[PDB]
Design a protein around this ligand. Structure first.
Ligand SMILES: Cn1cc(-c2cccc(C(=O)Nc3cc(N4CC[C@H](C(C)(C)O)C4)cnc3C(F)(F)F)n2)cn1
Length: 263
């Protein structure tokens, strides 16, 4: 399999829309990631438009796109370190200094996206990739949308994301602000990094694990595996009411966020 001067050597991933392949240029040996999409045309039009805007060290770089009939090829920066998902040990997590470093980088990427009026809407460890120097890069803009245009905020109403990562207001409100939704998903990623376990299948009324958290039953898993300092931050992020939820400027003032750590 090939595209112009690129050979598609290895399947890096498969999902909701197509497949991601390792593309090696036959001449130069440059290795990039290629997203292959069958057909949706209005969806990829929006996606390419968002991808062309992205210019930040913690966000995946877009190189260009090629169309071969009904097949779209999206050329992007390769993340040679793979996914954050594969750095999380099930039921353990990872060393707290590594989690803190990845969390600072995630915040840097999210601040950038929010600053250009883009919401990711599917922040999770499978979408958080690592470069050669273990730097976090926010990937996959297939669900990404404009929430601010001409300095005017637009409320969202679409159901999207991944249930264990979604904010409770998506399930309970007709319309909601984009930024607290991405902040909430970052809090679930932090939980996964520190405990190697997700706290609930979804933050709904019927979910006992979610009710346990709202009742402050932190003697339960995954919370009992987390140190008091990052746990205090999680208590400010995983707040049911999005208007009461901590914002990224205040996360940057948090005690754990600013706590010196080393393995
Ligand atoms: C859904 N989506 C993904 C992307 C996306 C955009 C840019 C870049 C990547 C990417 O590098 N993906 C990747 C890489 C790797 N590895 C493992 C070995 C490999 C090597 C040879 C050691 O370098 C790097 C693993 N998984 C993935 C990923 F993400 F699951 F696909 N994916 C856009 N939508």
């Amino acid at each position: 399999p090939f595209v112009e001067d690129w050979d598609l050597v290895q399947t890096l991933g498969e999902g909701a829309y197509g497949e991601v392949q390792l593309a090696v240029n036959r001449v130069t040996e440059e290795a990039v990631a290629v997203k292959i999409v069958d057909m949706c045309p209005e969806n990829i039009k929006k996606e390419i438009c968002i991808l062309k805007m992205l210019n930040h060290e913690n966000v995946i770089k877009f190189y260009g796109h090629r169309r071969e009939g009904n097949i779209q090829y999206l050329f992007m920066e390769l993340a040679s370190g793979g996914s954050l998902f594969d750095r999380i040990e099930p039921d353990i997590g990872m060393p707290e200094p590594d989690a803190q470093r990845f969390f600072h980088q995630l915040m840097a990427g999210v601040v950038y996206l929010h600053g250009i009026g883009i919401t990711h809407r599917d922040i999770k460890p499978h979408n958080l990739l690592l470069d050669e120097r273990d730097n976090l890069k926010i990937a996959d803009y297939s669900l990404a949308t404009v929430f601010r245009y001409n300095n005017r905020e637009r409320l969202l109403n679409k159901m999207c994301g991944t249930l264990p990562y979604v904010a409770p207001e998506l399930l309970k409100r007709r319309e909601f602000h984009a930024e607290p939704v991405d902040v909430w998903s970052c809090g679930i990623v932090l939980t996964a990094m520190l405990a190697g376990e997700l706290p609930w299948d979804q933050p709904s009324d019927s979910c006992q694990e979610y009710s346990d958290w709202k009742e402050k039953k932190t003697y339960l898993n995954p919370w009992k595996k987390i140190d008091s300092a990052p746990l205090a931050l999680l208590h400010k992020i995983l707040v049911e009411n999005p208007s009461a939820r901590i914002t990224i400027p205040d996360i940057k003032k948090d005690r754990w966020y600013n706590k010196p750590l080393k393995k």
